[PDB]
Short mmCIF file of C-alpha atoms in Angstrom, two decimals:
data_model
loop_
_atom_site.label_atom_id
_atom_site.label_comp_id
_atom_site.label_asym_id
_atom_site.label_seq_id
_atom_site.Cartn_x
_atom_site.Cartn_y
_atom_site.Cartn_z
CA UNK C 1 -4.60 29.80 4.10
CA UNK C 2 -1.10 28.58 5.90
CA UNK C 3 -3.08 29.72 9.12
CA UNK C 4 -6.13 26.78 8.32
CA UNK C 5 -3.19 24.20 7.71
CA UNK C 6 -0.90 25.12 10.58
CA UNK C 7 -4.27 24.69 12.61
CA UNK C 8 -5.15 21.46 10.95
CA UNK C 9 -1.63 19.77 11.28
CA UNK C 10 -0.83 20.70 14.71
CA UNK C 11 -4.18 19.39 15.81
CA UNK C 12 -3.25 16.02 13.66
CA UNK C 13 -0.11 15.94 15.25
CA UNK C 14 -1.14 16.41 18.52
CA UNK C 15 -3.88 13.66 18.08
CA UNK C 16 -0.36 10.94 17.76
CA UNK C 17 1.60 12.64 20.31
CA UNK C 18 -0.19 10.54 23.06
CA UNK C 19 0.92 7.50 21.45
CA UNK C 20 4.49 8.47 20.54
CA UNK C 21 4.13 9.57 24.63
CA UNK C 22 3.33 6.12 25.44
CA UNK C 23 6.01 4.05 23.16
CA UNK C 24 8.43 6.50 24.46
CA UNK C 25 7.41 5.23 27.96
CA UNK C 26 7.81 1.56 27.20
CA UNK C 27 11.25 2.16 25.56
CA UNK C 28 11.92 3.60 28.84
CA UNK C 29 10.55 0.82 31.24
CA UNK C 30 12.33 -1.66 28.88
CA UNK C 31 15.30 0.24 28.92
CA UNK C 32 15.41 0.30 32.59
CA UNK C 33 14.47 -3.20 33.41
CA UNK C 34 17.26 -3.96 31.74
CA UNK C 35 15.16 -6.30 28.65
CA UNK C 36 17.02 -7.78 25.95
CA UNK C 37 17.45 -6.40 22.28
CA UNK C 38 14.27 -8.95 21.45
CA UNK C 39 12.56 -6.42 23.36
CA UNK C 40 13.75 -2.73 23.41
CA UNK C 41 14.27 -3.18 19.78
CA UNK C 42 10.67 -4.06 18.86
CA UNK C 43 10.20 -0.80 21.22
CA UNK C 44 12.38 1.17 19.67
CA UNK C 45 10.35 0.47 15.86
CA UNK C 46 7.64 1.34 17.83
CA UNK C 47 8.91 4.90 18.59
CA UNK C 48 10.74 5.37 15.23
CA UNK C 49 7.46 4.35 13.37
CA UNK C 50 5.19 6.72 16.01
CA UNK C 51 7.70 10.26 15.43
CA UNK C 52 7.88 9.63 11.64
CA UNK C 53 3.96 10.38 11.54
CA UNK C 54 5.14 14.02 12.35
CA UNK C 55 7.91 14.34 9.97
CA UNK C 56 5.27 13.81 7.12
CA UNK C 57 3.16 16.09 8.60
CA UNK C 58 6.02 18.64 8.22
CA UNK C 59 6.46 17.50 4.35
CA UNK C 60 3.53 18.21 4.17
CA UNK C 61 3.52 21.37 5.34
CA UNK C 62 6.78 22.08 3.96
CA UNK C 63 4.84 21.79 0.23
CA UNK C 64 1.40 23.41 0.74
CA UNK C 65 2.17 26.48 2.99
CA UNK C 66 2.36 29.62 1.19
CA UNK C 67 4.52 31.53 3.31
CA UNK C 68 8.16 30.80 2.98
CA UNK C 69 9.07 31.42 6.95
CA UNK C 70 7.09 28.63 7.23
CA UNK C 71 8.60 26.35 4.95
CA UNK C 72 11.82 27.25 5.92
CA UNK C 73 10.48 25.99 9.55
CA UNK C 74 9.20 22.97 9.15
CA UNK C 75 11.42 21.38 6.82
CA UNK C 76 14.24 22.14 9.53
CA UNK C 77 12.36 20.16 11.94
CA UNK C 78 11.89 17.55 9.75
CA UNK C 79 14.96 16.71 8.34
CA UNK C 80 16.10 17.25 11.96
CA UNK C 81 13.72 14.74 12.94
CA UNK C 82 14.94 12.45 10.48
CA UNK C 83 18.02 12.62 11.50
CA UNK C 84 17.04 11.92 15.02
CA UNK C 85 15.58 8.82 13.91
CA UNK C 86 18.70 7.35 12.10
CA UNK C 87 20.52 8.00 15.58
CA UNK C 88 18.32 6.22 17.64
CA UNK C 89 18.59 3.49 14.81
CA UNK C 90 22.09 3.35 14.73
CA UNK C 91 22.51 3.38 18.68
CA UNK C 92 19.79 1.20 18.93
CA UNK C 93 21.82 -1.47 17.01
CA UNK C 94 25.27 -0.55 18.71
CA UNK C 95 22.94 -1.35 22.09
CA UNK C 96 22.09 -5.37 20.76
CA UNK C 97 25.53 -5.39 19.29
CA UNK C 98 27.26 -5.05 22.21
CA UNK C 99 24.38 -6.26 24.80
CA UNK C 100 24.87 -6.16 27.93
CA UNK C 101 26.01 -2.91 27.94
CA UNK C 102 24.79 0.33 30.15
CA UNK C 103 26.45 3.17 28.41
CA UNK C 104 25.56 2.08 25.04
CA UNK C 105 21.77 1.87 26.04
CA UNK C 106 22.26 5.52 27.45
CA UNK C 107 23.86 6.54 24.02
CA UNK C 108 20.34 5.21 22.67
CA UNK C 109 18.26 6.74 25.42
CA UNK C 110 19.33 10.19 24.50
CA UNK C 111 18.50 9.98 21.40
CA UNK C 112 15.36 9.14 22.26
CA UNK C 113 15.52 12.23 24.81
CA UNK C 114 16.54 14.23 22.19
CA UNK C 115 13.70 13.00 19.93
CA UNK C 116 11.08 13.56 22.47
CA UNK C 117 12.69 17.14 22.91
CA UNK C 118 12.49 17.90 19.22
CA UNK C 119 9.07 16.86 18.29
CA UNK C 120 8.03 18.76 21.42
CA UNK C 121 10.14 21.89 20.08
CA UNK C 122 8.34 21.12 16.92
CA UNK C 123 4.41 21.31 17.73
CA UNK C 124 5.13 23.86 19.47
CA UNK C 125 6.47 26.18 17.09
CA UNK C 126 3.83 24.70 14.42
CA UNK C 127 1.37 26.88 17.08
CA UNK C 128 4.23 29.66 17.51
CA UNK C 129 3.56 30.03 13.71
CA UNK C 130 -0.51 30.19 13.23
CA UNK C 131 -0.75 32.39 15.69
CA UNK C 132 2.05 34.83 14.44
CA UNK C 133 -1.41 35.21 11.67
CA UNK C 134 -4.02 36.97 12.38
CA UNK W 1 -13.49 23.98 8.12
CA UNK W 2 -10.72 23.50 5.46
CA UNK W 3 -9.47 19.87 4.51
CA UNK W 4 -11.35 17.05 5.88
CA UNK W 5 -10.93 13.32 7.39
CA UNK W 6 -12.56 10.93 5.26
CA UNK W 7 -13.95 8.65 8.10
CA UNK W 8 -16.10 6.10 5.66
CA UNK W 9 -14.44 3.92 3.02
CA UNK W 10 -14.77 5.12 -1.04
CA UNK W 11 -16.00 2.00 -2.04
CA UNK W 12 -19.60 1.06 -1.26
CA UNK W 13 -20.20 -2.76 -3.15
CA UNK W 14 -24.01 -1.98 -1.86
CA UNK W 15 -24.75 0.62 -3.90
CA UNK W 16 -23.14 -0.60 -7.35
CA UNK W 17 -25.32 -0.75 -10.35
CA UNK W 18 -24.50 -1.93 -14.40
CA UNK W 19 -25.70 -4.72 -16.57
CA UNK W 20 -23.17 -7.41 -15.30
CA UNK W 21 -24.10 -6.89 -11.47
CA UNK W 22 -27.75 -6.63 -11.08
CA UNK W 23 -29.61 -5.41 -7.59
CA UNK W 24 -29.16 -8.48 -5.45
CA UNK W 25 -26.76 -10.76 -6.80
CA UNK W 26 -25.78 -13.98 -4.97
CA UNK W 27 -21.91 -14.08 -4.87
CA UNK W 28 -19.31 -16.31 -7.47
CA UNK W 29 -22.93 -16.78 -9.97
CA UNK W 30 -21.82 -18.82 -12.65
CA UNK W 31 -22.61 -16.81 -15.22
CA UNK W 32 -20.41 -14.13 -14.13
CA UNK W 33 -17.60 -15.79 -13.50
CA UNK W 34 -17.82 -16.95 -17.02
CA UNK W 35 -18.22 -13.41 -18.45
CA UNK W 36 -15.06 -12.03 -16.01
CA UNK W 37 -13.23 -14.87 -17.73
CA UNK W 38 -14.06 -14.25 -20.86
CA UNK W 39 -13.27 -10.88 -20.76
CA UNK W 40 -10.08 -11.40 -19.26
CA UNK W 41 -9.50 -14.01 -22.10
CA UNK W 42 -10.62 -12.01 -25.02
CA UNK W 43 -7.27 -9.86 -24.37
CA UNK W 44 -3.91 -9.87 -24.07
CA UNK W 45 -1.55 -9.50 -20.67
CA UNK W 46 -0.63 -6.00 -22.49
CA UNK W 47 -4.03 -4.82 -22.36
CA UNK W 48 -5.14 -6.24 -19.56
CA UNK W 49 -2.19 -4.29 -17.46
CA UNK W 50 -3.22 -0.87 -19.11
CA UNK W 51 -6.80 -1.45 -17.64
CA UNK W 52 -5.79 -1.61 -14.07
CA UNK W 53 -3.30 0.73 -14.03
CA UNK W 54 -5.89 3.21 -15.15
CA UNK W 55 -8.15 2.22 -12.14
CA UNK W 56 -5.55 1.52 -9.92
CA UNK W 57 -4.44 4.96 -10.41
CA UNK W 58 -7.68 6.69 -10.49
CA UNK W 59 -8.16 4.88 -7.01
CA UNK W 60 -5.12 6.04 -5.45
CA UNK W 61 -5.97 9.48 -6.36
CA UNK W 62 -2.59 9.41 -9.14
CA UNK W 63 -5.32 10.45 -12.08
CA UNK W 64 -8.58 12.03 -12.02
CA UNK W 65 -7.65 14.73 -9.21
CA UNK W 66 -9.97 17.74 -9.35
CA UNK W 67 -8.68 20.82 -7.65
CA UNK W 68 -11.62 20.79 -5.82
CA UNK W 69 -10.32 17.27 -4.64
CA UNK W 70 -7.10 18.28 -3.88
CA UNK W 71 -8.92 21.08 -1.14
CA UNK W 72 -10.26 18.06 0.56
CA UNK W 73 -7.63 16.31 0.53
CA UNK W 74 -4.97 19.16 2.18
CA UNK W 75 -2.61 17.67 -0.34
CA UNK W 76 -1.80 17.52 -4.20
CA UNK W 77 -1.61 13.59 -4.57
CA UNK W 78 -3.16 10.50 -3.19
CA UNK W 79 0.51 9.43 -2.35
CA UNK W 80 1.20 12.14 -0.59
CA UNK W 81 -2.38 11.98 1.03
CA UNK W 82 -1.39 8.12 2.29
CA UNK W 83 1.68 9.01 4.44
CA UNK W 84 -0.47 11.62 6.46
CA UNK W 85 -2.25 10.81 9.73
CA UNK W 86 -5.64 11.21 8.24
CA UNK W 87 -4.71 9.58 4.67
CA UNK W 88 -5.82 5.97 6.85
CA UNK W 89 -9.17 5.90 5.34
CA UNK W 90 -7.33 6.38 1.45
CA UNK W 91 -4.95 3.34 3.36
CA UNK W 92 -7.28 0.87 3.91
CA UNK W 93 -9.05 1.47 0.57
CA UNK W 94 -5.75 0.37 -0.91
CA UNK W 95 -5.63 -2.59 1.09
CA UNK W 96 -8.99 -3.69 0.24
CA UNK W 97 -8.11 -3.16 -2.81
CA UNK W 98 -5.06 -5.26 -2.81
CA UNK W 99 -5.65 -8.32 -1.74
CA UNK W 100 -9.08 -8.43 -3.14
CA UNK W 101 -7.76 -8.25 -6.86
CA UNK W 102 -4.95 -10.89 -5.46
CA UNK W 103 -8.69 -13.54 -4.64
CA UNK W 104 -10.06 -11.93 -8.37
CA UNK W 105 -6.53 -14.01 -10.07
CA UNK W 106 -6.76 -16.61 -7.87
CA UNK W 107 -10.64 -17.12 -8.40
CA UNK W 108 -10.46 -16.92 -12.43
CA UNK W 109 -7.48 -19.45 -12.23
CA UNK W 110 -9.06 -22.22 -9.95
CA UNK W 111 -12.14 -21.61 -12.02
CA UNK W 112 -9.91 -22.87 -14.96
CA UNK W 113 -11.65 -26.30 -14.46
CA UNK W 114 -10.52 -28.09 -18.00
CA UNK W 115 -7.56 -29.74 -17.23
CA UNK W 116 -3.64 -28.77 -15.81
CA UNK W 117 -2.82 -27.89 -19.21
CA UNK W 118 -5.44 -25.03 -19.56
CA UNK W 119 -4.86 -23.38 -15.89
CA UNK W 120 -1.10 -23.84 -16.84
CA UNK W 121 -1.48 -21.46 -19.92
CA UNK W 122 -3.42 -18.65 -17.84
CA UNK W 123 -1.21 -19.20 -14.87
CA UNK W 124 1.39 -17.99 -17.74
CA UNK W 125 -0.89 -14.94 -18.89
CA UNK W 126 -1.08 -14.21 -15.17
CA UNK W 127 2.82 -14.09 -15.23
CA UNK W 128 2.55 -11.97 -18.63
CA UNK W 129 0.02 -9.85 -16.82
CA UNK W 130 2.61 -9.31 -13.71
CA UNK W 131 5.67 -9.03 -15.99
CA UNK W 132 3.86 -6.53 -18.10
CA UNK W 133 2.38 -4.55 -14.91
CA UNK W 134 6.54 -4.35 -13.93
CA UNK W 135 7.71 -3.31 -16.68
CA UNK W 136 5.76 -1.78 -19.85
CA UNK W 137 3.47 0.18 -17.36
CA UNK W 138 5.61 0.83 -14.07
CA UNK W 139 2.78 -0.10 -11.63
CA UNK W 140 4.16 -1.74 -8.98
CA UNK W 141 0.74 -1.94 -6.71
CA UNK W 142 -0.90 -4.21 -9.19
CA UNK W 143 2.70 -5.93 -10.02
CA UNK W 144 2.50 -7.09 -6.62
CA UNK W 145 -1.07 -7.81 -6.25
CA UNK W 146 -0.75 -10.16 -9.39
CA UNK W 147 2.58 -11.82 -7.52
CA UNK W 148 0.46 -12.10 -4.63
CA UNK W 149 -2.09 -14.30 -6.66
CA UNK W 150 0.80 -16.45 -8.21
CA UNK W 151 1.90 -16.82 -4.72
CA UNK W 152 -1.18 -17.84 -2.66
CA UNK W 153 -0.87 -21.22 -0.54
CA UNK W 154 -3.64 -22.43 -3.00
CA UNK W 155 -2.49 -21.60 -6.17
CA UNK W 156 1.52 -22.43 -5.39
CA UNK W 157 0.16 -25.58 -4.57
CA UNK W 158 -1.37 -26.88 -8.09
CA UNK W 159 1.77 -29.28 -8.71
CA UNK W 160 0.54 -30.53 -11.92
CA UNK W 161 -0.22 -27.13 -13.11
CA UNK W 162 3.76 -26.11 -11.87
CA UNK W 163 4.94 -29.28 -13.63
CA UNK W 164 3.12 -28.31 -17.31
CA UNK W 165 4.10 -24.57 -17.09
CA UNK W 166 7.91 -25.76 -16.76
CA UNK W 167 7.59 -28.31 -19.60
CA UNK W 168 4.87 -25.66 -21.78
CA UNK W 169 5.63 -22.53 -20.90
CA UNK W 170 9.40 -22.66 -20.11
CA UNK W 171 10.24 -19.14 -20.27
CA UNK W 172 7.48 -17.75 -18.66
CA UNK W 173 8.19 -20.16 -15.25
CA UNK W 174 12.03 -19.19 -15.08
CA UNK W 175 10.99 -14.92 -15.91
CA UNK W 176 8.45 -15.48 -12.76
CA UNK W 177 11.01 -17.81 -10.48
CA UNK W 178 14.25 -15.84 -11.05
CA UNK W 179 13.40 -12.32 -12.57
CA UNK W 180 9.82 -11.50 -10.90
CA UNK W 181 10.25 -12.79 -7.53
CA UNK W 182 13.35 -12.18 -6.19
CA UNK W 183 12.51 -8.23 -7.91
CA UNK W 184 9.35 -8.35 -5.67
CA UNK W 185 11.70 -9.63 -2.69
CA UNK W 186 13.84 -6.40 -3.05
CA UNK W 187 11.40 -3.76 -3.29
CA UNK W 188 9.64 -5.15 0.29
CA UNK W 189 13.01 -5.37 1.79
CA UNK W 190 13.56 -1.68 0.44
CA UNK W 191 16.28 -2.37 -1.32
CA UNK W 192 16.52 -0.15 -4.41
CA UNK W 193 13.48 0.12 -6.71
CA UNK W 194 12.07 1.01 -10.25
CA UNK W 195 13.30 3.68 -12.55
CA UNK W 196 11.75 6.98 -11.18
CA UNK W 197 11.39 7.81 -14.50
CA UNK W 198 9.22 4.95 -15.72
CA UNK W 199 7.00 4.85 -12.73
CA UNK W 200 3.12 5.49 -12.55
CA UNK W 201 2.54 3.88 -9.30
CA UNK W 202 5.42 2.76 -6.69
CA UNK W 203 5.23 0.62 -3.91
CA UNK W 204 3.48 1.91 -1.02
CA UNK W 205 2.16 -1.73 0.23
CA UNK W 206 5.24 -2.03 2.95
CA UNK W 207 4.30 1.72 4.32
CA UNK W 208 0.79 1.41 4.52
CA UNK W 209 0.28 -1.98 6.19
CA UNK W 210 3.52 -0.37 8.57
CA UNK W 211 1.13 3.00 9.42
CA UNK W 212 -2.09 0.81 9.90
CA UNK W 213 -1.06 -0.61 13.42
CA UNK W 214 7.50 -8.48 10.97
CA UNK W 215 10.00 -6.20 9.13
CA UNK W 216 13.21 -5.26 11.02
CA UNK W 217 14.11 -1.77 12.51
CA UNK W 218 15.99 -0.84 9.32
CA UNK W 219 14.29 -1.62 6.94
CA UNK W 220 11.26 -0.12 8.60
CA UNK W 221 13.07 3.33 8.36
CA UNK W 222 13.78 2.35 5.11
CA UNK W 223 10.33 2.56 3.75
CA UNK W 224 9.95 5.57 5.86
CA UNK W 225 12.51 7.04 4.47
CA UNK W 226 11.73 6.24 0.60
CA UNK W 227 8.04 6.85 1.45
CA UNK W 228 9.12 10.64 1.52
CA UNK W 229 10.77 10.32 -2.31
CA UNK W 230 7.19 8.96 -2.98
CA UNK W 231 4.85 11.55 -1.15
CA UNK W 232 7.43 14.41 -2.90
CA UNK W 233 7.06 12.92 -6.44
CA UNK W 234 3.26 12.91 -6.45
CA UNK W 235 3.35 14.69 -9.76
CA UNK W 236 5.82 12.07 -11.29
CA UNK W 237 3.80 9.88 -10.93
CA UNK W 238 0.45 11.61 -12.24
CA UNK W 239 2.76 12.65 -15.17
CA UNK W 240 4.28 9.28 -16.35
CA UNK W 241 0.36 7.73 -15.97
CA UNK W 242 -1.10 10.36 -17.92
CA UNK W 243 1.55 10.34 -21.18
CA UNK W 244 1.71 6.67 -20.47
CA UNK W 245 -2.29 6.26 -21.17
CA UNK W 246 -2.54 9.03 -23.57
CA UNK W 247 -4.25 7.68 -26.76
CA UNK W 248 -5.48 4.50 -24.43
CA UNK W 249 -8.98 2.98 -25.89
CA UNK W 250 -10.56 1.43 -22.35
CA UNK W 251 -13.25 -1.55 -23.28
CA UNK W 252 -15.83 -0.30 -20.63
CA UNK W 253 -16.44 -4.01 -19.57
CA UNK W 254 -13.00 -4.57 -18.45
CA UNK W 255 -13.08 -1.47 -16.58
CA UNK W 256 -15.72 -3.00 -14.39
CA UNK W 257 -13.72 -6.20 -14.14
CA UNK W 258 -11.09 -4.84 -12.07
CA UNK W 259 -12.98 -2.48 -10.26
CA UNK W 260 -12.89 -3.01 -6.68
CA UNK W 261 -16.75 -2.62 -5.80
CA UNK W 262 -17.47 -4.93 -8.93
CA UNK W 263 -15.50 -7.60 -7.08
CA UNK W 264 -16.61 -7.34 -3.51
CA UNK W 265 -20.10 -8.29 -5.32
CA UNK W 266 -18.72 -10.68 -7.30
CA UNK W 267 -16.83 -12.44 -4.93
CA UNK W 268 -19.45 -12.14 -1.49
CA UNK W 269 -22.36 -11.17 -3.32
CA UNK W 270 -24.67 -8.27 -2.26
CA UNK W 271 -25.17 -8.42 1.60
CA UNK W 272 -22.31 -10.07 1.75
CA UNK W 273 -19.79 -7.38 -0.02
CA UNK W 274 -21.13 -5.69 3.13
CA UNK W 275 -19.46 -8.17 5.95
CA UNK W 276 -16.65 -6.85 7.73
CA UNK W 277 -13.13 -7.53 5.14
CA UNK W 278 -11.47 -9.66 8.45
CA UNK W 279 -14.69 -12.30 7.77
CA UNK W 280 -15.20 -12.01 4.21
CA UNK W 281 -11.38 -12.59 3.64
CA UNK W 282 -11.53 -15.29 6.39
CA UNK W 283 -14.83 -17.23 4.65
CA UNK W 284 -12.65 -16.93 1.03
CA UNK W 285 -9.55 -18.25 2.41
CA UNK W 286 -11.29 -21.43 3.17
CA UNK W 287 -13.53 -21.53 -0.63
CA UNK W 288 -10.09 -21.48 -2.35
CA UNK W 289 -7.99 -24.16 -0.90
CA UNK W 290 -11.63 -25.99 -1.45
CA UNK W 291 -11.49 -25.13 -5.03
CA UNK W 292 -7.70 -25.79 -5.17
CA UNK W 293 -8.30 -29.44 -3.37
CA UNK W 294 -11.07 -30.66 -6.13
CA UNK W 295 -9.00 -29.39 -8.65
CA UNK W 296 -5.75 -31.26 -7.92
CA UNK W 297 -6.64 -33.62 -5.30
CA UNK W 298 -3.76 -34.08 -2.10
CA UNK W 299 -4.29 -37.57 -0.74
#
């Protein structure tokens, strides 16, 4: 019943989108009040730790679901998701590295962009899917 | 409709029944601590370790998984079931169970009231028990719930007990200060673990005290990242436990002994196995370095 699952997930994911929402939006404050790596750091674990809830949801997914379109879906998005997370860690650190510095906190805020782009992407094609069955 | 959120805890201490707890026991009876420590005693570190890994297992949903559990559940195995969103319940089971077990050591050794030279020998079957735990059965939740004993402000500080165990039990103190340790240091800064191949239960206590909410951004995704080798190898695990146990003869009585209900009644009695685990962990903290101050005094 991939239909019963996509259902399920995409309701638990969207129950932790509101809080990946709102770490997002601290990074961002942070970010722009120009906060030390003591800070935006802490933030960023914050927003790494919130968007990894979703790529075990896709795992997930990615085991149970019977039809193979859909696991060929949903373990793209989360090994893309993964990967989004090891670039906002990497540019995260190049940001304290080399703190003060604007452009390397932008390289890290568009990962984050990107991040927030991708698990959007991703819920949304998690209900692009269970309603494709009917 | 289909899979479900487990919203209450597994364990319920107030509704536990057998001949060593009866209906309303008043918690650390004599009596009973006696038996427990007998019953640890009667056995060796070997078979001690094959008990809880049995129940730690069953527990974490690694053995004893209907299919009709497994519908509940959404997922195959417990481990998978503790990296998703609605796995918390499964989570804080864990944790309870955890650093309950970790009181349960600590308990039997400041009960070890004959002398430095006594406690010194079953601090040294504890260190069997956690060696054993590592290595013959690949458990590494009980491993480090047996470490956490060894390691507990009140326990660490029994000097003379330290002292004897270096001059008595001289292997046993270097195997836990330079092999056990610094192994358990490692596998929390997710640095390279156990043998996939030898494993019955890996270590999930960074990720799920990480999900229910100190470590630094890396390593963070580090147990993220690993915690997906885990969820993916749910049937590893089940595998290794079940050849691993094949042929095991349980004793019934230690079964109990290291089941989590039977020591939330032991240790707070009935009522108070009931009391939120922030008090009842609070009220304990304070009967052990007691215990551990009339035992070795610190003047």
């Amino acid at each position: 019943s991939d239909r019963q699952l996509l259902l399920f997930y995409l309701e638990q994911c969207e129950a932790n989108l509101t809080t990946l929402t709102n770490a997002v939006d601290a990074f961002f404050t942070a970010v722009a009040t120009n906060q030390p790596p003591k800070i935006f750091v802490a933030h960023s674990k914050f927003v790494i730790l919130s968007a990894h809830k979703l790529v075990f949801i896709g795992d997930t997914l990615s085991r149970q679901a019977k039809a193979a379109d859909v696991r060929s879906q949903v373990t793209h998005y989360s090994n893309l998701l993964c990967d989004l997370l090891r670039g906002i860690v990497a540019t995260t650190k190049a940001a304290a590295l080399q703190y003060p510095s604007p452009s390397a906190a932008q390289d890290m805020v568009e990962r984050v962009k990107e991040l927030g782009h991708s698990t959007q992407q991703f819920r949304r094609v998690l209900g692009q899917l269970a309603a494709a069955l009917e | 409709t289909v899979p479900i959120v487990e919203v209450t805890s597994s364990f319920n201490p107030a509704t536990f029944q057998s001949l060593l707890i009866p209906r309303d026991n008043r918690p650390l009876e004599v009596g009973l601590l006696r038996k427990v420590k007998e019953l640890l005693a009667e056995v060796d570190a070997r078979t001690l370790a094959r008990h809880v890994t049995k129940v730690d297992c069953l527990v974490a949903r690694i053995l004893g998984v209907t299919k009709e559990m497994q519908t509940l559940m959404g997922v195959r195995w417990g481990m998978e079931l503790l990296t998703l969103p609605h796995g918390r319940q499964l989570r804080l089971d864990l944790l309870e169970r955890f650093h309950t077990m970790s009181i349960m050591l600590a308990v039997d050794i400041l009960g070890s009231t004959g002398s430095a030279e006594e406690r010194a020998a079953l601090l040294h079957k504890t260190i069997q028990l956690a060696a054993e735990l590592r290595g013959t059965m690949g458990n590494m939740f009980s491993f480090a719930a047996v470490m956490g004993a060894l390691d507990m402000a009140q326990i660490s500080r029994l000097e003379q007990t330290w002292v004897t165990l270096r001059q008595r039990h001289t292997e046993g103190a270097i195997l836990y200060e330079k092999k056990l340790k610094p192994f358990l240091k490692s596998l929390n800064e997710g640095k390279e673990g156990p043998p996939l191949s030898n494993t019955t239960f890996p270590h999930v206590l960074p990720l799920i005290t990480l999900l229910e909410s100190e470590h630094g951004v890396e390593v963070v995704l580090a147990h993220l990242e690993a915690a997906r080798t885990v969820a993916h190898h749910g049937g590893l695990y089940h595998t290794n436990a079940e050849v691993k146990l094949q042929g095991f003869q349980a004793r019934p009585e230690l079964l109990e002994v290291f089941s989590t209900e039977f020591q939330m009644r032991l240790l707070w009695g009935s009522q108070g196995a009931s009391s939120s685990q922030a008090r009842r962990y609070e009220k304990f903290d304070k009967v052990l370095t007691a215990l551990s101050h009339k035992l070795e005094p610190a003047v």
